[PDB]
C-alpha cells in the first residue's frame, strides 16, 4: 500500500491524510487525476479528477494547488472547475429535454500551468511511494448547524420577484419569436409551402407530431 | 359519489351571441348540442366520482364547476347562464353518527335531587 | 381394534359383585389402593338405605371412529367405549338425590380396580398409563382414560380409550328428567343433573340414529371432518363451557345438528338440508342455518331421533335443540356467551364463503385462532380471586352459596362463573359486544388414588388459580362517558330499583339538556386506562369479592406508549377524542374561506388538504405553536382554473406557479395581516429545482404548505416521458412515480382513508403506535407514511379470520401478526377499501392479480420492488412501495418474526413490550450517536411549551431540526455505496430531553469487496493493486464525522 503510486490505466493515486477524530482512535484519502482530451474549447486545459472529498470547491482546489506550488517551487493557476454535482440533482436536464458521476473537471489558465501541476502530482505520487508523512492533509469545509439552517432558511422575496420577472421576459420574447417563425408563411427553396394549423407555435413541436 | 350517495344532477345553459353577432338569434347545430352535452356530463361524472358529499357541497358553493364547464366548452360555442339547476338525492348509505358529528363540528348532567 | 378386542375379553373375564352397604364398600376401597371418585356431594351413610351392585354391562362404542370419520390427529384423540348398566340393578327410586350417581361412582371404582388387577395379570402395565378424567370436563361424570407410552403398544397411533358409564334406554323417565324438572330435593330445577342423567340413559340411540343418517347420506363423514377441523381451528370443543371454559359444541353436537337438519330444521319443518348434497353443500347449509337461526333467545329447534325437525319461535334462554323422542336438550353444556360467539363465528364464516372474488379456504380451515388471547379477543384483564375455603366463602364472597344455589350450580365452579358473567354483563351492557372468562388453573385429569381434582394454589381449594376475563368490545360504545340507566318516576320502578341496588354509591338522579330524567353513574376518562377498566374494577370489587385483584398493566403500558401531547386535561383525554384534529380542520376552514374569497386574474378551482393529521394519522396530535414537529406543516394541494395560455415549458411553468404564489403572498400580507407567510424552496421531487411551497403560519398556532398542481404539469411530465432516452427511462419513471404518489392518488387516498377511518375509528390510534414503534426501529427514512397507513388498515379491512380490532393492543398485535405471517416475495396484497356491510370486482381483481404476476415475472426476488400493495386507488401497487431496498425489507420482516417469537415464548408482559419498543442496533456497519445541543420535546409539545411564533422566520428555521436533512443528503451522496437510517421524530425519540439520534449505516456487500477501478465506480476507495480497488472505510468515517462535525458525539464501527 506504500509503493502503490499510480494505476496502469494512466490514473495517479493522490493521498490525503486525516486528523484524529475524538470518536476514532490516520488513513490516506485517495484521489485521482488525469489530463483531459476533449474537442470543446471551454474544456481545454483541464484535469479529470476522481474521488474528490466532501465539498471540493474552488477555494479548496486553489488551496491544494497552492500547497503543491509552495512545496515544489512551481506556478500553476486554477482558472475554473466543472462537473461538481456530488449529490446528483442535475443528472437530467428536463428544461431542454421538454423544450461524469462522482468525478469533476478542473480547468487551468494555460497548458504550462496544467503540465506544471501535473508534474506536481507526479512528485506527490512519488511522495506516496517513499515518504508517506510528506503527503498533504485535506481539511474539509466542515458543514455546520449554520450551513444546515441556511439550507433551512426561507427565500428572499425580492430575489424571487426579480428572477420571475426576467424569466417571464425572456420566455415571452422567445415564444413570440417562435410564434412568428412558425406562422410567418414559410416557403421552401423549390416551390413548396408547408401546412401549419392555427394556434400552433413550435417547429420542434411539428417535428414531434411527425414523430 | 365516492360517499356512495346516489345522486341525479340537472344543469342548464344558454346559447349566447357574440359581440360581433349581427344575427338576431344565436342558434347552434345539434352536433354542437350533443357534443357539449357529452362534455358536460363527462365533467359532472368525473367531478362527483372524484368528490365526496361535503366535498361536493364545498364545490357547489362558489359556482366553480360551471366555470370549469365554461372553460372546457370555450372552444365549441359561446354560451351563457351555465348553471347546475337541481340536485336529487336518490339513495343514502348506512348511518354514521360519528361522521355526522365530525362534519358538523360528550355531555354531562346537572345533579337534580 | 385388536386392543379393544382384547379389552373386551378382559371385561367379560371381569367378575361381578353384589348389593353392599357403605361400610362394606369403604372397607373394600380402603384396603384396595383404588379410591372411589365420589362426585360432590359424597354419600353420607345416614341418608342412604340403598346399596350398590355391579353386574355385567352391555358394551358399545361412540366417537369419530364409530362414525368412521376419524383423522390423524397430531396431538392425540380418543375412542369412547361405553358400558351401559343393568336395569335389574337399577330402580325407579335411583334418579333422585344422586343415588344413580353414587351407584355409577362405585361401579367405576370397582371397574378400574379389577381392570388394574387384570392388567397386573396380562403384564401390559409397563407401557400403559391409567388415570381418571371427566367426560368433556364434567366433574359430575368421571370416566376412564386409558393412555399409552413408548404386543399391544398402540402408543404410535396417538389414540386413547375413554371408558364411559351410561344407563340403559328408558330407565328413568325423560319427562321427569326434563331440564325444567327437579330431582334434587331439599323448588328450583336441576338442569345439568337432568341433562347429564338423561344423556347417560340415552347415549346409544343417538349413535344408532346418527349412523342411520350417515347411511342415508353420502358425504356425512366428510361434512363431519369439516365441522371438526373448523371447530378445532376456531378453538371449540364438546366440553361443558359453564365452568370458565369455551365449549358446549363439538364433533358430536355438530353431527347431531347435521342429522336434525337432514331431518328438517325449518319453521315449517321442511327439508332445507337435502341428502343429495355434496360436502361443501352440507357445510354451507349448516353454517347458514346456525348463522340465521337462534337456538337460545327468541327461538329453538326440535326434532325426533325416531318425526321431522321443526323450528319453534320460543328460545328457552339457552341454546335449545329439543329431542322429543328422548326429551333431551342437546346443547345444555353450552353457555349463552359461547353460543353468541359461535353464532358470530358462523356469521363471519358465512361472509367468508360468500366472498366470490377472493378465496377463503386457507383462512377458514387452515388458521388456528386460539393461540393468543390478545389476538382472539379485544380486551383482557386478570382477576386474582383468592377465595379460600368452603367455610370462608361466606366471608370472602359478597354473595351467598346456599342450598338452592347448589341445586342450580352443583359445582361452585359453575356458580362463580355464572355469577361473574351476569354481574359483568349487567355492569357493562352496551359498551361490550361479547364476554368470555377463563378460570386459569382448571384441570380435568387426576390419578386413581384421589376422589376428585384437588387444588391448593391461588388462595383457593378449587380447580383454578385466578380468572382471566376477555372481551370483544363495541368500538362505537366503549368510550361513552356515562353508563345509561333507567328513568325516574314518583313510584320507583323495579328496573331502576335493581339499577340503584347494583350501582350503590354510583347511583344518582341526573337531568340533561333536552329535559330528560333518569338515573346515571359518573366516570372520568383517562389517557392511561379506559372507562371499561375502571367499571370492571368497580363491579368485581363491589359485588363479587372485596379481596379480588383486577388489572391489565399491558394496556396500561400501551396507553402510556401512546404519545401524550402538551394539552390541558390531556391526562384525562382518552384515545377516541379527535379534538385537535377538529381544531386544525376549523382553522383550515378559516383559511379556506379567506383564500376562496381572495381574487386572482384566474379562478381558484380547488384547494385540498393531504395532511397526515387531516387524515388523522400524524404521529402526534398537533399542538398550537409547536412548529418543531416534523408533521407541523400539512401539505395543501392547489389547483386553478384551466387556462389555454399556460407556459408550455417546465421551468417557466413552475416559475409562473412561483409568481401566482407571490400574488397570494402579497394579497395575504395586504388583507390578512394577522397571518405570517414565507416561501420555502421545495425540491423533494428530483430534477425539478424550482418548487416553492407557500408556508403560512396562523395565530391559532398552526402552519401549512401551499403548492400548485396543473394539468399542464401532468402533460409536460408525459411529454418528458415521451422524449426521454431509452436508458434515461426508468429513473424518470421513478420521478413521475414519486410525483403522482405525492400529488395525484394522495388526495383520493386521504379522502377514502378519512371516510373508512370514520367507519373504523380505532384505526387512527393504532397507526399512531405503529410508526412510533417503527421510529424506535428507525426504518422511517425509507418506508412511506401512506404505505404504513395501508399496512395498519389491512387487518381492519381484512379482519378474517379474527374480528375487527376494537382495542389498541389487539390492532397492534394483528398488524404485527400479519406482517410476520406475510411473504411479500410470493404473496400479493389487495385491499377492498369499503365501509362495513364500492367493492372491488372480480375482473379488476384478475387484472391486478395478473399485474402482480407480470411484476413477479420481471422481478421474481424483489430487487426492484418487494411489497405489492394494491387497492381501488392503486391499480399498480408500486406507488408507495418503490424506493425501499431488500436489506430493509429483510430487516423489518426479521423484526416481525422475532416479535412473534418473543410473544410466543416469553408470553405477554411489560418486559416484552419494552423489548419490542427498544431498538436492536445490530447488523450495522457503522453507528453514529449524535445529540442536538437543544432538546425539542417541550417545543414539539409532547408531555414530559411554546406560546407564540418568534419574529424571525430564520429563528423558526433555527428551532427546526437538521438531522433529517443531514441523513437524506448523506443518502443522496451515498446511494451508490451505503444505506442509512435515522430517527425522524426527535421529540418522541430523543431520550429524556428529546435531543438524541442514532444513525445506522450498512455497506453494500458488492462494494465491500474489490472491483476494477472504473471512471463511474463512484466510491471512496483505497487501491489494493494498481488495477483493483477496495473501499476507503476510514475515509467514509471521517467524512461523515466532518459532515455532522458539530452534532457527532460518538461513532462506532462493526
What cell was used for C942? 409532547
What is the distance between the alpha carbons of residues B36 and B42, in angstroms, rounded to a whole number?
10
- Nearest-CA neighbor of C702 among C570, C583, C577? C583
Distance from the Cα of residue A47 to its chain's centroid: 11
- Nearest-CA neighbor of C69 among C235, C220, C179? C220
| H or E segment and range at residue C585 | helix C579-597
What cell was used for C959? 428551532
Q: Please check whether residue C963 is in contact with residue C604, taking contact to mean a CB–CB distance below 8 angstroms.
A: no
What is the distance between the alpha carbons of residues C529 and C615, in angstroms, rounded to a whole number?
25
Q: Which residue of C has its CA nearest to B110?
A: C511
Give strand pairing partners of C337: none
- Nearest-CA neighbor of C340 among C260, C221, C416, C246? C246
| H or E segment and range at residue C981 | strand C978-981
What is the distance between the alpha carbons of residues C666 and C672, in angstroms, rounded to a whole number?
10
What is the distance between the alpha carbons of residues A177 and C366, in angstroms, rounded to a whole number?
72
Nearest to A18 among C662, C1027, C1038 (CB): C1038
Distance from the Cα of residue C449 to its chain's centroid: 42
- Nearest-CA neighbor of C330 among C222, C194, C215? C194
Domains of chain A by start residue, with CATH: 1-109 (no CATH), 110-169 (6.10.250.2760)
Q: Is the dihedral of CA C837, C842, C843, C849 positive or negative?
A: positive
The H-assigned helical ranges of C152-296 are 191-201, 204-216, 220-234, 251-262, 279-292
Would the CB atoms of B102 and C835 count as touching at under 8 Å?
no
Contacts of B101 (CB under 8 A, 6+ apart): none
- Per-residue burial over C809-844, b = 16 or more CB atoms within 10 Å of its CB, e = otherwise: bbbbbbbbbebbebebbeebbbbebbbeeeebeeee
Q: Which DSSP state fits C934?
A: S
What cell was used for A35? 489530463
- Nearest-CA neighbor of C1040 among C926, C887, C923, C885? C926
Q: Which DSSP state fits C817?
A: H
What is the distance between the alpha carbons of residues C1033 and C767, in angstroms, rounded to a whole number?
39
What is the distance between the alpha carbons of residues C1010 and C1020, in angstroms, rounded to a whole number?
12
Q: Please check whether residue C694 is in contact with residue C633, taking contact to mean a CB–CB distance below 8 angstroms.
A: no
Q: Which DSSP state fits C745?
A: H
What is the distance between the alpha carbons of residues C870 and C855, in angstroms, rounded to a whole number?
13
| Phi then psi dihedrals of residue C180, to 5 deg | -85, 0
Q: How close C559 gets to chain B, by Cα (Å)?
A: 21
Q: Please check whether residue C576 is in contact with residue B35, taking contact to mean a CB–CB distance below 8 angstroms.
A: no
> Which C positions 670-729 lie with beta carbon below 8 A of chain A?
678-681, 683, 686-689, 692, 695, 716, 719-720, 722-724, 728
What is the distance between the alpha carbons of residues C65 and C712, in angstroms, rounded to a whole number?
74
Contacts of C743 (CB under 8 A, 6+ apart): C637, C709
| H or E segment and range at residue B9 | strand B6-14
Q: Please check whether residue C1030 is in contact with residue C1009, taking contact to mean a CB–CB distance below 8 angstroms.
A: yes
Distance from the Cα of residue C96 to its chain's centroid: 46
**Strands lying side by side in the sheet with C926-931:** C978-981, C996-1003, C926-931, C1048-1053
| C77 three-class SS | strand
Q: Identify the residue among B109, B111, B112 best suited for mutation to test binding to C, counting C beta carbons within 10 A and taking the highest.
A: B109
Q: Do chains B and A touch (3 or more CB pairs under 8 A)?
A: no
DSSP string, C641-658: ---TT--SSHHHHHHHHH
Q: How close A96 gets to chain C, by Cα (Å)?
A: 9
Maximum C-alpha span of chain C:
113
| C1031 three-class SS | strand
Q: Which DSSP state fits B46?
A: H
- Nearest-CA neighbor of C766 among C800, C801, C802, C797? C797
| H or E segment and range at residue C929 | strand C926-931
> What does each C-alpha distance from A74 to A78, C216, C608 come to in angstroms?
13, 110, 64
What is the distance between the alpha carbons of residues C211 and C228, in angstroms, rounded to a whole number?
17
DSSP string, C8-33: HHHHHHS--EEEE-HHHHHHHHHHSS
> What does each C-alpha distance from B35 to B9, B66, C36, C951, C954 come to in angstroms?
18, 16, 96, 57, 55
DSSP string, C663-713: HHHHHHHHH-TTSEEEEEEE--STT---EEEEEEEETTTEEEEEEEE-HHH
Q: Please check whether residue C980 is in contact with residue C1000, taking contact to mean a CB–CB distance below 8 angstroms.
A: yes
The H-assigned helical ranges of chain B are 30-50, 53-60, 64-72, 97-104
Give strand pairing partners of B84: B11
What is the distance between the alpha carbons of residues C226 and C496, in angstroms, rounded to a whole number?
48
Q: Please check whether residue C623 is in contact with residue C567, taking contact to mean a CB–CB distance below 8 angstroms.
A: yes
What is the distance between the alpha carbons of residues C784 and C879, in angstroms, rounded to a whole number?
10
Contacts of A63 (CB under 8 A, 6+ apart): none
Q: Is the dihedral of CA C598, C604, C606, C608 positive or negative?
A: negative
What is the distance between the alpha carbons of residues C529 and C558, in angstroms, rounded to a whole number?
9
Q: Which DSSP state fits C946?
A: -
DSSP string, C198-238: HHHHSSHHHHHHHHHHHHHSSSHHHHHHHHHHHHHHHT--S
Contacts of C818 (CB under 8 A, 6+ apart): C791, C794, C795
Would the CB atoms of A145 and C1027 count as touching at under 8 Å?
no
| H or E segment and range at residue C1043 | helix C1033-1043
What cell was used for C166? 351410561
What is the distance between the alpha carbons of residues C566 and C614, in angstroms, rounded to a whole number?
19
> What does each C-alpha distance from C87 to A66, C107, C174, C328, C1000 come to in angstroms?
119, 14, 16, 20, 81
| C92 three-class SS | helix
Bond before C907 cis per omega within 30 degrees: no
Where do we find the cell 484521489? A31
DSSP string, chain A: --S--B-TTS-EEE--B----TT----B--EEEEE---S-STT-SEEEEES--TT--HHHHHHHHHHHHHHHT----EEEEE---SS-S-SS-HHHHH--TTEEEEEES-HHHHHHHHHHHHHHHHHHHH-TTSS-B-------HHHHHHHSSPPPHHHHHHHHHHHHHHHHHHHHHHHHHHSS--B-SSS-B----TT---HHHHHHHH-
Q: Considering only CB atoms, which chain C residues are within 8 Å of B93?
A: 835
Maximum C-alpha span of chain B:
84
What is the distance between the alpha carbons of residues C771 and B96, in angstroms, rounded to a whole number?
28
Would the CB atoms of B112 and C752 count as touching at under 8 Å?
no
| C162 three-class SS | strand
Rounded to 10 degrees, the C-alpha dihedral C469/C475/C480/C483 comes to -40
What is the distance between the alpha carbons of residues C85 and C77, in angstroms, rounded to a whole number?
26
- Nearest-CA neighbor of C237 among C132, C114, C137? C137
What is the distance between the alpha carbons of residues C502 and C486, in angstroms, rounded to a whole number?
13
What cell was used for C305? 331421533
Q: Which residue of C has its CA nearest to B95?
A: C759
Q: Identify the residue among C676, C677, C683, C962 best suited for mutation to test binding to A, counting A beta carbons within 10 A and taking the highest.
A: C962
Domains of chain C by start residue, with CATH: 1-166+200-216 (no CATH), 167-176+217-372 (1.10.1410.10), 373-481+525-551 (3.30.70.3020), 552-921 (no CATH), 922-1054 (3.30.70.3030)
What region, left, alpha or beta, does residue A102 occupy, with left being phi > 0 and alpha being psi -120 to 50 degrees?
Answer: left
The H-assigned helical ranges of C682-807 are 711-723, 729-759, 763-776, 785-797
Contacts of C172 (CB under 8 A, 6+ apart): C92, C94, C95, C100, C197, C198, C201
Q: Please check whether residue B93 is in contact with residue B3, taking contact to mean a CB–CB distance below 8 angstroms.
A: yes
Q: How close B65 gets to chain C, by Cα (Å)?
A: 8
Q: How close C705 gets to chain B, by Cα (Å)?
A: 20
| C155 three-class SS | helix
Q: How close C835 gets to chain B, by Cα (Å)?
A: 9
Distance from the Cα of residue C551 to its chain's centroid: 19
What is the distance between the alpha carbons of residues C955 and C114, in angstroms, rounded to a whole number?
94
What is the distance between the alpha carbons of residues A117 and C695, in angstroms, rounded to a whole number?
50
Contacts of C413 (CB under 8 A, 6+ apart): C139, C242, C243, C244, C439, C442, C462, C463, C464
Q: Please check whether residue C612 is in contact with residue C633, taking contact to mean a CB–CB distance below 8 angstroms.
A: no
Count of CB pairs separated by less than 8 Å, B with C: 70
- Burial group, residue C123, by CB count within 10 angstroms (0-12, 13-18, 19+): exposed
- Nearest-CA neighbor of C143 among C116, C170, C161, C159? C161
Resolution stated for this PDB structure, in Å: 7.1
Counting every residue written for chain B, the total comes to 113
| C59 three-class SS | strand
| Phi then psi dihedrals of residue A39, to 5 deg | -80, 0
**Strands lying side by side in the sheet with C676-682:** C604-609, C633-640, C702-709, C691-698, C676-682
Give strand pairing partners of B106: none
Amino acid at each position: 500500500i506504500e509503493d502503490i503510486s499510480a494505476m496502469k490505466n494512466g490514473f495517479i493515486v493522490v493521498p490525503f491524510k486525516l486528523p484524529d477524530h475524538k470518536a476514532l482512535p490516520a488513513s490516506l484519502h485517495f484521489m485521482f487525476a488525469k489530463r483531459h482530451q476533449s474537442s470543446n474549447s471551454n474544456e481545454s486545459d483541464c484535469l479529470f479528477l476522481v474521488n474528490l472529498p466532501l465539498l471540493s470547491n474552488i477555494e479548496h482546489m486553489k488551496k491544494f494547488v497552492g500547497q503543491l506550488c509552495g512545496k515544489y517551487d512551481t506556478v500553476s493557476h486554477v482558472e475554473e472547475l466543472l462537473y461538481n454535482d456530488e449529490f446528483g440533482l442535475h443528472e437530467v436536464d428536463l428544461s431542454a429535454l421538454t423544450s461524469p458521476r462522482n468525478t469533476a473537471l478542473l480547468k487551468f489558465v494555460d497548458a504550462a500551468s496544467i503540465n506544471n501541476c501535473w508534474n506536481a502530482l507526479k512528485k506527490y505520487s512519488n511522495l506516496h511511494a517513499k515518504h508517506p508523512n510528506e503527503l498533504f492533509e485535506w481539511t474539509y469545509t466542515t458543514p455546520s448547524f449554520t450551513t444546515f439552517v441556511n439550507f433551512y432558511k426561507p427565500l428572499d422575496i425580492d430575489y424571487l420577484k426579480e428572477d420571475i420577472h426576467t424569466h417571464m421576459a425572456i420566455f415571452e420574447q422567445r415564444e413570440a419569436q417562435a410564434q412568428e417563425d412558425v406562422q410567418s408563411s414559410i416557403v421552401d427553396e423549390d416551390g413548396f409551402t408547408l401546412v401549419v394549423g392555427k394556434n400552433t407555435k413550435s417547429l420542434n413541436s411539428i417535428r414531434k407530431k411527425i414523430l | 359519489t365516492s360517499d356512495d350517495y346516489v345522486l341525479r344532477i340537472f344543469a342548464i345553459a344558454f346559447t349566447r351571441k357574440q359581440a360581433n353577432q349581427v344575427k338576431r338569434h344565436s342558434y347552434a347545430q345539434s352536433s354542437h348540442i350533443r357534443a357539449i352535452r357529452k362534455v358536460i356530463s363527462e365533467i359532472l361524472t368525473k367531478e362527483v366520482q372524484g368528490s365526496t358529499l361535503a366535498q361536493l357541497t364545498s364545490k357547489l358553493i362558489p359556482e366553480v364547476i360551471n366555470k370549469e364547464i365554461e372553460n372546457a366548452t370555450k372552444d365549441i360555442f359561446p354560451l351563457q347562464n351555465i348553471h347546475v339547476r337541481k340536485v336529487k338525492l336518490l339513495k343514502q348509505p348506512k348511518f354514521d353518527v360519528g361522521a355526522l358529528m365530525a362534519l358538523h363540528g360528550e355531555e354531562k348532567g346537572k345533579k337534580v335531587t | 381394534e385388536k386392543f379393544l378386542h382384547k379389552l373386551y375379553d378382559i371385561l367379560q373375564e371381569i367378575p361381578d359383585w353384589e348389593e353392599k352397604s357403605l361400610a362394606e364398600v369403604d372397607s373394600f376401597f380402603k384396603n384396595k389402593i383404588v379410591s372411589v371418585p365420589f362426585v360432590d356431594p359424597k354419600p353420607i351413610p345416614q341418608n342412604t338405605n340403598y346399596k350398590f351392585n355391579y353386574k355385567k354391562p352391555d358394551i358399545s362404542l361412540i366417537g369419530s371412529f364409530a362414525l368412521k370419520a376419524g383423522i390423524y390427529q397430531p396431538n392425540g384423540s380418543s375412542i369412547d367405549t361405553l358400558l351401559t348398566m343393568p336395569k335389574e340393578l337399577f330402580e325407579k327410586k335411583d334418579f333422585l338425590n344422586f343415588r344413580c350417581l353414587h351407584k355409577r361412582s362405585v361401579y367405576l371404582a370397582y371397574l378400574t380396580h379389577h381392570l388394574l388387577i387384570l392388567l397386573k395379570k396380562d403384564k401390559l402395565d409397563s407401557f400403559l398409563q391409567l388415570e381418571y378424567s371427566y367426560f368433556d370436563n364434567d366433574p359430575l361424570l368421571p370416566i376412564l382414560r386409558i393412555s399409552c407410552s413408548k404386543d399391544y403398544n398402540f402408543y404410535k397411533t396417538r389414540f386413547s380409550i375413554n371408558l364411559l358409564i351410561g344407563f340403559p334406554y328408558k330407565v328413568f323417565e325423560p319427562k321427569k328428567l326434563l331440564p325444567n324438572r327437579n330431582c334434587i330435593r331439599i323448588l328450583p330445577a336441576t338442569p345439568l343433573y337432568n341433562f347429564s342423567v338423561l344423556s347417560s340413559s340415552t347415549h346409544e340411540n343417538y349413535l344408532k340414529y346418527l349412523y342411520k343418517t350417515k347411511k342415508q347420506t353420502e358425504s356425512f363423514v366428510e361434512a363431519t371432518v369439516l365441522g371438526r377441523l373448523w371447530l378445532q381451528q376456531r378453538g371449540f370443543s364438546s366440553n361443558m363451557s359453564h365452568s370458565g371454559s369455551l365449549g358446549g359444541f363439538g364433533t358430536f353436537e355438530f353431527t347431531i345438528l347435521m342429522a336434525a337438519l337432514l331431518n328438517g330444521g325449518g319453521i315449517n319443518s321442511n327439508k332445507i338440508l337435502l341428502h343429495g348434497f355434496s360436502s361443501y353443500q352440507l357445510f354451507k347449509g349448516v353454517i347458514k342455518y346456525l348463522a340465521t337461526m337462534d337456538l337460545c333467545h327468541d327461538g329453538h329447534l326440535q326434532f325426533h331421533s325416531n318425526p321431522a325437525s321443526k323450528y319453534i319461535d320460543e328460545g328457552f334462554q339457552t341454546p335449545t335443540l329439543f329431542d322429543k323422542s328422548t326429551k333431551v336438550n342437546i346443547l345444555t353444556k353450552m353457555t349463552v356467551s359461547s353460543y353468541q360467539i359461535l353464532k358470530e363465528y358462523a356469521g363471519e364464516t358465512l361472509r367468508m364463503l360468500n366472498n366470490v372474488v377472493q378465496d377463503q379456504f386457507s383462512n377458514i380451515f387452515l388458521t388456528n385462532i386460539s393461540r393468543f388471547d390478545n389476538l382472539k379477543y379485544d380486551l383482557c384483564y386478570d382477576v386474582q380471586l383468592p377465595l379460600g375455603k368452603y367455610n370462608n366463602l361466606e366471608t370472602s364472597l359478597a354473595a351467598t352459596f346456599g342450598s338452592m344455589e347448589r341445586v342450580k350450580f352443583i359445582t361452585l365452579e359453575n356458580f362463580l362463573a355464572h355469577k361473574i358473567t351476569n354481574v359483568a354483563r349487567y355492569a357493562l351492557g352496551d359498551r361490550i359486544k361479547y364476554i368470555q372468562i377463563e378460570m386459569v388453573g382448571q384441570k380435568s385429569d387426576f390419578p386413581i388414588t384421589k376422589r376428585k381434582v384437588y387444588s391448593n394454589t391461588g388462595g383457593n381449594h378449587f380447580n383454578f388459580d385466578f380468572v382471566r376475563v376477555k372481551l370483544i368490545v363495541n368500538p362505537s360504545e366503549c368510550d361513552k362517558l356515562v353508563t345509561k340507566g333507567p328513568a325516574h318516576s314518583e313510584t320507583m320502578s323495579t328496573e331502576a330499583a335493581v339499577f340503584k341496588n347494583f350501582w350503590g354509591i354510583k347511583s344518582s338522579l341526573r337531568r340533561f339538556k333536552d329535559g330528560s330524567i333518569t338515573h346515571c353513574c359518573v366516570w372520568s376518562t383517562s389517557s392511561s386506562e379506559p372507562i371499561i377498566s375502571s367499571i370492571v374494577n368497580f363491579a368485581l370489587q363491589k359485588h363479587v369479592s372485596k379481596k379480588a385483584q383486577i388489572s391489565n398493566e399491558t394496556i396500561k403500558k400501551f396507553h402510556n406508549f401512546l404519545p401524550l401531547p402538551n394539552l390541558p386535561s390531556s391526562a384525562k383525554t382518552s384515545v377516541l377524542n379527535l379534538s385537535s384534529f377538529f381544531n386544525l380542520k376549523k382553522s383550515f376552514d378559516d383559511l379556506y374561506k379567506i383564500i376562496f374569497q381572495m381574487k386572482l386574474p384566474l379562478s381558484v378551482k380547488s384547494i385540498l388538504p393531504v395532511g397526515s393529521a387531516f387524515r388523522y394519522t400524524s404521529l402526534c396530535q398537533p399542538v398550537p405553536f409547536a412548529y418543531s414537529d416534523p408533521d407541523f406543516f400539512q401539505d395543501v394541494i392547489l389547483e386553478f382554473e384551466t387556462s389555454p395560455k399556460w407556459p408550455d415549458e417546465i421551468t417557466s411553468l413552475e416559475k409562473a406557479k412561483t409568481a401566482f404564489l407571490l400574488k397570494i403572498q402579497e394579497e395575504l400580507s395586504a388583507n390578512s395581516s394577522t397571518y405570517r407567510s414565507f416561501f420555502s424552496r421545495d425540491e423533494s421531487i428530483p430534477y425539478n429545482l424550482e418548487i416553492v411551497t407557500l408556508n403560512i403560519l396562523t395565530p391559532e398556532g398552526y402552519g401549512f404548505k401551499f403548492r400548485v398542481l396543473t394539468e399542464r404539469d401532468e402533460i409536460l411530465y408525459l411529454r418528458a416521458i415521451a422524449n426521454a432516452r431509452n436508458e434515461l427511462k426508468p429513473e424518470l419513471e421513478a420521478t413521475f412515480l414519486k410525483f403522482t404518489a405525492k400529488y395525484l392518488a394522495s388526495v383520493r387516498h386521504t379522502r377514502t382513508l378519512e371516510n373508512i377511518s370514520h367507519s373504523y375509528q380505532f384505526y387512527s390510534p393504532v397507526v399512531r403506535l405503529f410508526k412510533r414503534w417503527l421510529d424506535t426501529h428507525l426504518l422511517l427514512g425509507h418506508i412511506t407514511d401512506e404505505l404504513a397507513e395501508l399496512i395498519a388498515i389491512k387487518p381492519f379491512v381484512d379482519p378474517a379470520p379474527y374480528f375487527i380490532p376494537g382495542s389498541l393492543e389487539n390492532g397492534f398485535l394483528k398488524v404485527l401478526k400479519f406482517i410476520s405471517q406475510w411473504n411479500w416475495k410470493d404473496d400479493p396484497l389487495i385491499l377492498d377499501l369499503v365501509k362495513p356491510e364500492e367493492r372491488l370486482t372480480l375482473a379488476q381483481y384478475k387484472g391486478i392479480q395478473m399485474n402482480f404476476t407480470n411484476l413477479r415475472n420481471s422481478d421474481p426476488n424483489g430487487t426492484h420492488l418487494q411489497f405489492f400493495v394494491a387497492s381501488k386507488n392503486d391499480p399498480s401497487g408500486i406507488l408507495y412501495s418503490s424506493g425501499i431496498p431488500l436489506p430493509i425489507a429483510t430487516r423489518l420482516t426479521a423484526l416481525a418474526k422475532v416479535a412473534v417469537n418473543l410473544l410466543q415464548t416469553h408470553g405477554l408482559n411489560q418486559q416484552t413490550i419494552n423489548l419490542l419498543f427498544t431498538p436492536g442496533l445490530k447488523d450495522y456497519d457503522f453507528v453514529v450517536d449524535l445529540r442536538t445541543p437543544i432538546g425539542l420535546k417541550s417545543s414539539c409539545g409532547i408531555l414530559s411549551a411554546p406560546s407564540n411564533f418568534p419574529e424571525n422566520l430564520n429563528d423558526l428555521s433555527e428551532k427546526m431540526d437538521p438531522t433529517y436533512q443531514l441523513v437524506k443528503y448523506l443518502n443522496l451522496k451515498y446511494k451508490n455505496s451505503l444505506i442509512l437510517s435515522s430517527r425522524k421524530y426527535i421529540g418522541v425519540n430523543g431520550g429524556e430531553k428529546g435531543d438524541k439520534n442514532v444513525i445506522t449505516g450498512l455497506i453494500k456487500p458488492l462494494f465491500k469487496g474489490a472491483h476494477k477501478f472504473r471512471v463511474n465506480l463512484d466510491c471512496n476507495v483505497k487501491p489494493v493493486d494498481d488495477e483493483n480497488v477496495i473501499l476507503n472505510k476510514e475515509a467514509i468515517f471521517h467524512e461523515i464525522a466532518a459532515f455532522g462535525n458539530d452534532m457527532v458525539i460518538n461513532f462506532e464501527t462493526d
